[PDB]
Design an enzyme around this catalytic site. Structure first.
Site, PDB file in Angstrom:
ATOM      1  N   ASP A   2      -5.152  -2.691  -2.042  1.00 15.46           N
ATOM      2  CA  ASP A   2      -6.612  -2.694  -2.039  1.00 15.46           C
ATOM      3  C   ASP A   2      -7.252  -3.052  -3.396  1.00 15.46           C
ATOM      4  O   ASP A   2      -8.343  -3.596  -3.515  1.00 15.46           O
ATOM      5  CB  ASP A   2      -7.016  -1.321  -1.510  1.00 15.46           C
ATOM      6  N   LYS A  42       0.876  -1.167   0.000  1.00 14.35           N
ATOM      7  CA  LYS A  42       0.000   0.000   0.000  1.00 14.35           C
ATOM      8  C   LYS A  42       0.924   1.231   0.000  1.00 14.35           C
ATOM      9  O   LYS A  42       0.946   2.080   0.898  1.00 14.35           O
ATOM     10  CB  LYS A  42      -0.882  -0.075   1.238  1.00 14.35           C
TER      11      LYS A  42
END
EC number: 1.1.1.42
Lengths: 414, 414
Positions: B281, B228
């Protein structure tokens, strides 16, 4: 200063916790980079047709373009990615809507979407995900999912507090941690990047309060606090405890069995809302195996991010998922997908995400009727299999429409 | 000292990077709390039958019980949850296997599973997830998933570096961050818990090295670094860059197009392994929409945790997912599910997770034949619909077997 305010149109007002919306409100919109140039025209057109239809010409939105991202540098000069007056104009006009945003790499610029959320203190990221009948899904039973995600927007590792490996700063904080704090738990303290993860009481009780309130106001069945508290006891585990405490302290929650779950009686419907919790990695498994057991979800920034992206994929909505960032003083509704530059200008991407965000905008404004016409339109276009390229690939017997035309298809099923 | 070493049996030896396994090796096993009392007997029995069958009596495992968790306090006294000699005995005998483990709450005791991983420096959490034909799945196409997860085990927010809101320690580090470091980015510095997230160069290059190596050794098609990094630039984003750097520097990786993806030629099969990356994600969305595009995955501690739990749910394997923690000096194979105390002693839970972890153990030992007989047994029992309660609920026309009996069903299909 380069925004032109509409000569017709009146500012929405905040008269202590309540919006006072005029019949001709000025709404700021940020067009967005990439495919924002395709989706935002489609949204202005279907929202206009929905308020024209619902209120028979009495109400009209005066749209005001404001700037952020790549278009902001073409209007104010190559260096300004976030004009100070966008923050002021969203603060002032109270509700705004935006398309996808490009953050540049190379110039030390942190995520412009997270910058709008933080700078305006829009501490609630609200992500409703439900299945729209007939959209292609990778799972057997997408219809079982109807959840609303309350993701905390102002703390967690998303606060951008970090230092590079081998920087002076990094060396300095690693020195403080080992010498002053006595941490013998960093496995390799040389060539080591450090990130800070804060979680406060105020920060989690204001988001959980809005989650329970949402559940009372819409008679939802339960609020699930998801956290990774077994490993992160004082940030994630503090989030679950402060959330249960607030349900006891402010909502009169009572123990079911001998805990940990609570019951909050809905003071309007008489029904009991369960306040429960589940570990974040077991939850990622539970939304796939038992989605009908969950409803309103409250969680921290990073988890909320993962949960909503994952859930939007299983109902077939990676491109029709709506979202809002709500603070005490303003709200910003948004396309939750990316700028997708390869398609930009081709009129083919799904305008569904920013259109369903606009219905969240209208509902927030109190214009429920115009808002129900948009989700009526949406269900009917998708059911007609009169659909955009991303939905048609996965469907048999669909009619392929451009971006703009799916806009018209939403108006036709209104 | 309370472990009794087998009179017959010989220690496995590490003769510089290579295991030298005797014909009668002593393997330490930790029984496990809860349903460990049901699953571990089932595993000892099917592994014994698999080595008896494959090597026709020449090889035999001498099993040595060692202690951790709730059973450790019943053997050494109420206070010792992790005996120092378990760490020594796993270090010494080189490979061990364990059942589920109870960590207590109330006594400031941090996760005993993460304590074994850290204390022994078993920096690779290896999680293979593939679909076993005929197991009930929540998704339309589970057969498309065949991934191997290399999760980093020794850094990330899992290092347990944190301080309570309002503690002196917390106040002190928040003071250092605001006054000495100048951070104006903590939204509420009072009543605030703080967690530290470290990511080093050494820490990520040793895990990525093992991931690419796995891919060369098994001719896998690609290695995906998931991170991320858009929000966490100096920990997660440093992980993707150090991982690409190591693929350039040590594996002779070359740019595909104009980047970012690399190609590594497999020096044994001649084929090209793609080294790519995807944001964490979007990846949680991609394993559901395009699972056939991914194969070997490398990621940090927390993401790896979420990814493998999520992936094990979509192939129907929340209770048959295997796992290993591998270091340079020893390896610990494990049931990856929980202690499930309500079922403990009832002989009904699925022994599949610890049995498939034992086949990973056998394969690691070089006993490939005995290991192929276990996954042969497994496929046949599941295909026979001669199955445990958790699989039978979701299946039509299955025969319900107890835990022990599914053990026998694996031996019957061998």
């Amino acid at each position: 200063s380069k925004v032109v305010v509409p000569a017709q149109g009146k500012k929405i007002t905040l008269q202590n916790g309540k919006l006072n919306v005029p019949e001709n409100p000025i709404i700021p919109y940020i067009e967005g980079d990439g495919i924002g140039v395709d989706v935002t025209p489609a949204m202005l057109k279907v929202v206009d047709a929905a308020v024209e239809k619902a209120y028979k010409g009495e109400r009209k939105i005066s749209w005001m373009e404001i700037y952020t991202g790549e278009k902001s540098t073409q209007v104010y000069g190559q260096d300004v990615w976030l004009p100070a007056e966008t923050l002021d104009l969203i603060r002032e006009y109270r509700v705004a809507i935006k398309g996808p945003l490009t953050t540049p790499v190379g110039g030390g610029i942190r995520s412009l979407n997270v910058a709008l959320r933080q700078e305006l203190d829009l501490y609630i990221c609200l992500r409703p995900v439900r299945y729209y009948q007939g959209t292609p899904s990778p799972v057997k039973h997408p219809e079982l999912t109807d959840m609303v995600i309350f993701r905390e927007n102002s703390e967690d590792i998303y606060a951008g507090i970090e230092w590079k490996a081998d920087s002076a700063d990094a060396e300095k904080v690693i020195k403080f941690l080992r010498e002053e704090m006595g941490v013998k738990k960093i496995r390799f303290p040389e060539h080591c990047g450090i990130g800070i993860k804060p979680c406060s009481e105020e920060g989690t009780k204001r988001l959980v309060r809005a989650a329970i309130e949402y559940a009372i106001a819409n008679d939802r069945d339960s609020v699930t606090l998801v956290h990774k508290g077994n490993i992160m006891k004082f940030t994630e585990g503090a989030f679950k405890d402060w959330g249960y405490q607030l349900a006891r302290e402010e909502f009169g929650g009572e123990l079911i069995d001998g805990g940990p779950w609570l019951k909050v009686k809905n003071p309007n419907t008489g029904k009991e809302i369960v306040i429960k919790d589940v570990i974040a990695d077991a939850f990622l498994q539970q939304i796939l195996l038992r989605p009908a057991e969950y409803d309103v979800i409250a969680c921290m920034n990073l988890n909320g991010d993962y949960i909503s992206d994952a859930l939007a994929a299983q109902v077939g909505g990676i491109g029709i998922a709506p979202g809002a960032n709500i603070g005490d003083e303003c709200a910003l509704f948004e396309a939750t997908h990316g700028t997708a530059p390869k398609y930009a200008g081709q009129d083919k991407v799904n305008p569904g995400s920013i259109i369903l965000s606009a219905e969240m905008m209208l509902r927030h404004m109190g214009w429920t009727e115009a808002a129900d016409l948009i989700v009526k339109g949406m269900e009917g276009a998708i059911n007609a299999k009169t659909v955009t390229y991303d939905f048609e690939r996965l469907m048999d017997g669909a009619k392929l429409l451009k971006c703009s035309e799916f806009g018209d298809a939403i108006i036709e099923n209104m």
